[PDB]
Structures are given as C-alpha cells and as structure tokens.
Specification:
Chain lengths: 260, 266
C-alpha cells in the first residue's frame, strides 16, 4: 500500500510513506502540506543522474528512495514574494549555503553584513497552593510562541542584490565555437565570458524574447526586436539541455505573472 | 559534539543532529522552525515512561532517541486560534487519528461528514478532481506551465473537519482514572474549559465541572489532589490517583490549560 521515501530539506532528513500508485505531484504536495507551504511553484524534488541535476516528474509514478527538496526557481523580490515564513526560511538556508560555499560571489562588506544577519537568525534569546500560583505566573512568560525571523528576510534582501544570485550557469559554445556561459534566471537569458560570471556580455529579458527553439544540441534565441540578431548556441549534454529548457519555461512564466 | 534525534510527527519522520549540551527548548524550537510554526504553545515533544505519557522538559538537557511532536493543549475555538495553516494541519491529523481510533466518540452522521472532509483535505488542496522543441512547442510549454503550477491552496477542508470535531463532547479532554474520598471510582477530565468529574460509564457528560475561572487553587500532596472552588458555597473536591507519573502529567495539563483559558479571556 505504501513505501518509504527519504526527503532531504535544508533543515532535516525526513521520511514519508508514499502510496504505491502516487505520482510525483502527490509526493511533492504531501511534503509541502507537512511544512505548511503554499508558495510551492519555487520548489521541486531533486536527484542526480550520473553527474547532472534531475528534477522528479509530477505526472510520472514515483518508482531507500531519496529526493532533495530544493528551490528550482528564485523570487525577483524576496520581501514581496516570500509571504510565508517557511518559504523565507527554506530560501534563507539554501542561499546561505551558496554564500558560504562561494557558489555565489560575495564582496567583503556584503559578506560581513550577511554573516551578522545569519548570527541573529541562529539565536532567539508535591504542589502547595502557593506553588500552584508560582507555576501559573511562570508558564505565561515561558510559553508565548516563536517570533517571525526577520533576520532571514534581511539576509535575502542583501543576497538577492548579488550579481550571481539565482542564476543557473551552463557551459555553451556559440556558432564560431567560442566557449561561453549561459545564465538562466528570473530576468531572462544571459551570455557570459567563461571567466566573468558577474557581468553578462549579452542579456535577453523574458519580455524581449519572441521564442526559444531547440534542435540537435543547438538552441536558438529569437529576439522580439528584428534589429537584434538571433543567438544560436550549442550545449554538449542532452540531460543538461532538458534542464535548461525546464528553467527557461518556469522563469519565463514567473516573470510574466510578476508583470500582472 | 552532536547525537541523532528522531522526531516523529503525525504522518512523517524527521531526524535532527542535536548538540550534546542542548536543552529541550533548543531541540523543540528547531522542530518548530523546520515546520515554520510560531503558534508553538499548543505543542511539545512526547515520549513514554513504562506505559505513561511523558513530555520533554524545556530547561533540562536532552539526555535512537525518539520524541513525538504532538499537541499537548487544544484550542477552545479552532477557526479563531489556528491562524497558521501548519497549526491547523497538525491538529487535523492528530484529531483525525483520535476519531478513527474511537478515542473521541463520534455519532454516525458526523462520522460520514468528517470522512468526506478528510477525502477533500487529502487531495482538494492541489487537485480539484480530488484523485526536440520547436517555437510552437515552446509556446505550448509556456501555456501548459501556468495551469500546472498554481501553488497549493490553503487546505480549508481540514478547518471544516476541526469545526465538526470540536463540537464532540470528548474532543480535547484528557481522561484519568481517579477515586473520591468515599472511594467511588470516577474519571477526571482535564481540558481547555476546566476540570470535570465523570461517572466511568459516561465520558460524554460530566457530573461536576470546575471552570478554570471558578477555581481558587489546586493543591497536590502524596496521591491526593484538592480542588478549592472560588465560591465558598461549593464544597472542596478531594480525589486520589494511584500512579505518581500520571499525577505529574495531570498538574502539567492543569497549569497550561488554566493559563491558555485566561489569555483567551484577555
């Protein structure tokens, strides 16, 4: 009737009883409901095929099975978009790991400022009738509930202004065979020199892209403006190319919703 | 340092690395932060000594170690008090288990209503039925993504479940076997409203009720409890409980429920 699934969040190693005939969406929505999470479009269940990132399909049946509950997509504006504390918390921990691992470049002042908010996010600080009265008074102060962790939001507001924040990088080659990087993020598609992940050479905002097409390892970005040339590029791995397109669709659509 | 702690919820398991010198409050607040839970006063970390329910102390150091994250206290009004969905969800699962186990008596009509809301709470949330790339393919994959990714709705069916459940006489009552000074075998009910004395052959309607606002004090000394009412016309109620671990639990539930009762009356 059910089988055990290990779900790893940034917080904990969790275990769920997944029904035999359940699809990816049923397992995913169980995890979300467990964490009281409604802002679910950011998240997915990740695993690795060979050495590539893979995200669990929501329409396929799920079949110690292990997935990582992670953000696939990032907000453009953390304060406006992360309304629930759980979403703020999960983003905070994922972004902080990327800061500490130096996956996101961070300048010295931002480093010490982020570190200070992380410190604040880490730390929140017989019976006689007379004993009954003392135990009444003591209980009120001891049981008032957790305050919302505003430091986590202050952290994300600094982090989101970093050039490398929420950018997915992929090694690519243009039609001349020049090695470059592709950045897929909230704002659009970006082409980088391989030795500068901070400042793109070219940017294609999602509103300025007529279409993207993919055939036989070649991507084509068709801009909305006919004065701007089409950008064709190559990526060698097919499993990586499927991931790029997944991130293009999601980020495009979340971009459009943010513009009402 | 650290040691592994298993935290079992109502339908999931989570493992945490608990620091050696950490107190119960450190471990408890880590679990609450993991679930994004701020309405924490309802909850505790439960374990069992011999066959009795025990709750982990927040000032004592924590020392496969397993605790159950459960509600120790119940709201008087679920809709008003369970503002966060997580709190609603955790109460829904705990109360549903008590309904299905028949720990809370439920009449047949309420039971089939509860079962219908449980179906809707299970899937209605995200499923309204309740259980190469060409430029043209790019356009189709854009349009398909919007409908496929809408977010989870607040699981309102759970609140509807709790609103039916909270009107059941046995809901949120902690029962304890007790004897009065004449030696009559009776039950003590500890709940959000006060203390209740039951005939053992009727857990639904109490013989005597002492509302928390109408209790001057409670005292306990060596197996015997004393309820002193506020009104001097009402006699003091003395009763006996045989098990010492059960008596520590009774007093814990008396203090918490008394204090939550008073906060609700501002």
């Amino acid at each position: 009737k059910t089988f055990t699934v290990r779900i790893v969040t940034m917080d904990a190693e969790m275990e769920f009883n997944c029904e035999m005939k359940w699809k990816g969406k049923d397992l995913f929505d169980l995890v979300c409901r467990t964490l009281g999470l409604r802002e679910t479009w950011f998240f997915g269940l990740q695993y690795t095929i060979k050495d590539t990132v893979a995200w669990l399909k929501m329409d396929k049946k799920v079949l110690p099975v292990t997935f990582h509950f992670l953000a696939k997509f990032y907000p453009e504006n953390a304060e406006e978009e992360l309304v629930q504390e759980i979403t703020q918390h999960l983003f905070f921990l994922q972004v902080k790991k990327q800061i500490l691992d130096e996956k996101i470049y961070c300048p010295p002042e931002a480093s010490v400022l982020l570190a200070s908010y992380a410190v604040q996010a880490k730390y929140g600080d017989q019976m006689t009738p007379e004993m009954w009265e003392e135990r009444i008074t003591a209980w009120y102060a001891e049981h008032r509930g957790r305050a919302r962790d505003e430091a986590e939001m202050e952290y994300l507001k600094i982090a989101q202004d970093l050039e490398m924040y929420g950018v997915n990088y992929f090694a690519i080659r243009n039609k001349k065979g020049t090695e470059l990087l592709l950045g897929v993020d909230a704002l659009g598609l970006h082409i980088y020199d391989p030795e500068n992940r901070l400042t793109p050479k070219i940017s294609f905002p999602w509103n300025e892209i007529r279409n993207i097409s993919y055939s036989d390892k070649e991507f084509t970005i068709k801009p909305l403006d006919k004065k701007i040339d089409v950008f064709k590029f190559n990526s060698s791995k097919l499993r990586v190319n499927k991931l790029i397109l997944q991130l293009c669709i999601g980020n495009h659509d979340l971009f459009m919703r943010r513009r009402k």
